[PDB]
Amino acid sequence: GPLGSDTKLYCICKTPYDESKFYIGCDRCQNWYHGRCVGILQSEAELIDEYVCPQCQSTEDA
Known part of the structure; x- marks a missing residue:
């Protein structure tokens, strides 16, 4: 029964989610990061429906 730990913001850019900002x-x-939060297109936000996180890739495979 680990003590556990509080959660953190989303954007790998050390910044919590912002409805003003859009995520993928x-x-x-x-997880969700501002488009540029990870160095992505703006459109990559809209024309997207299979985008993956960059932190995810680390987990995807070795």
């Missing part, structure tokens, strides 16, 4: 959800890392 880690297909496998269930």
Whole structure:
């Protein structure tokens, strides 16, 4: 029964979610970062429906 730990912001850019800002959800890392938060297109936000998080890729495979 580990003590556990509080959660953190989403954008790997050390910044919590912002409805003003748009995100792309880690297909496998269930997380959201401002488009540029990870260095992505703006459109990558809209024309997207299979985008994956960058932290996810680390978990994807070795």
